[PDB]
UniProtKB/TrEMBL annotation, chain B:
Portion of the parent chain present: 39 to 161 of 162
Example GO BP: antibiotic biosynthetic process
GO MF entry, a single one: isomerase activity
Organism expressing this protein natively: Mycolicibacterium fortuitum subsp. fortuitum DSM 46621 = ATCC 6841 = JCM 6387
Binding site for Ca(2+): 18-19, 21, 23, 25, 28
Keywords noted in UniProt: Calcium, Membrane, Metal-binding, Transmembrane, Transmembrane helix
Name the UniProt record assigns to this protein: Allene oxide cyclase barrel-like domain-containing protein
Domain of life of the organism encoding this protein: Bacteria
Automatic annotation (TrEMBL), chain C:
Protein name (Swiss-Prot/TrEMBL): Allene oxide cyclase barrel-like domain-containing protein
UniProt: Ca(2+) binding residues: 16-17, 19, 21, 23, 26
Domain Allene oxide cyclase barrel-like: 2-117
Source organism, top-level taxon: Bacteria
Cysteines engaged in disulfide bonds, as pairs: 48-62
Length: 122, 123, 121
């Protein structure tokens, strides 16, 4: 099962803790509307914790839940948090996606042009 | 054969982080622990965190993670659901000990009442 | 299969919210460099949430992701968060560690002698 999801950010909190500006311990909490071919197919919610920030690369531990009609999909990542694609591990899901594994690649994170490419093994 | 369990839940310690804009909005967070009992005897405890991913006046959505500790092992659950007084169902994603390789669901009823319960179906 | 990783704290944020000092709702966010025999073999990142604090025991829900070349390892714990050794559950991984389970014991946490001892099944 594959899916190309267009991601429209719904709400986002970019929490600046600690030292002003992006640094270890900051965190983003967010929700998105998911679409395919211009039709909404579901939504998601997630949190990213900035575990390591250098000027070239802010590293995040991210947790994401996707809600689709057939069920939910759970993913997690420890990756650079940039526009370059990064791949989250799909650890499971519910409904049609129970006991699923696979990968979710995030492109253009935290921009209007964000997309997910899902590859599920089930 | 699926196993069910009915746990009575008493909130132990709780922090409601009102981050971001004061008042309920995206990015707020609850961190909590509970005492678990059955038939009037403590059987374990839990700890968890909820993140408000989307807040509108009609529906505050939370991503929640929960760990239950029993003598027989741990149980892990997660949800992305409205964070209201209505019952909501979490996915059991795994566990330890007796609950190693567990899957299933956990329904939370009466949240933030004295009669809060978890109803588990483990497969 | 066992594995012992030496752990060097890289960046750490200790968020003291609410009442000063450890109490429910505080959180630590961290990254580490992982090494074996003095050579870096990967890195990790994690977050701990203080779920219950009494004078005797600061309980944390911790999530950890270890990144090695062969794959990632996911662990989580609900345990006391002291200098004493504590054991995390390995819930999964990627690559070589896909479908991994087991336990990860953290000793010497946040000291120069921190180590992870993994038992993967
Ligand atoms: O930090 C962020 C801000 C706003 C939206 C985001 N969406 C994500 C989706 C998958 C993984 C990480 C993400 N991080 C995000
Ligand atoms: O936000 C919360 C505050 C206090 C206690 C809570 N207990 C929960 C148990 C299962 C799932 C979500 C929960 N959220 C909670
Ligand atoms: O609170 C902390 C501060 C600095 C480093 C830490 N490393 C950990 C590794 C596994 C579990 C919990 C941890 N907590 C940590
Ligand atoms: Ca900051
Ligand atoms: Ca707020
Ligand atoms: Ca505090």
């Amino acid at each position: 099962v594959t899916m190309t999801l267009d991601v429209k950010n719904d709400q986002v909190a970019k929490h600046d803790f600690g030292k002003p500006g992006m640094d270890v311990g900051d965190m983003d909490i967010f929700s998105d509307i998911l679409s395919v071919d211009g039709k909404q197919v579901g939504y998601d919610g997630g949190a990213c914790f900035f575990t390591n920030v250098t000027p070239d690369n802010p590293m995040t531990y991210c947790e994401l839940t996707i809600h689709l009609d057939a069920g939910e999909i759970f993913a997690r990542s420890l990756t650079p948090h940039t526009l370059a694609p990064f791949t989250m591990a799909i650890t499971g899901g519910t409904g049609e996606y129970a006991n699923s594994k696979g990968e979710l690649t995030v492109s253009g994170v935290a921009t209007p042009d964000e997309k997910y490419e899902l590859k599920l093994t089930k």
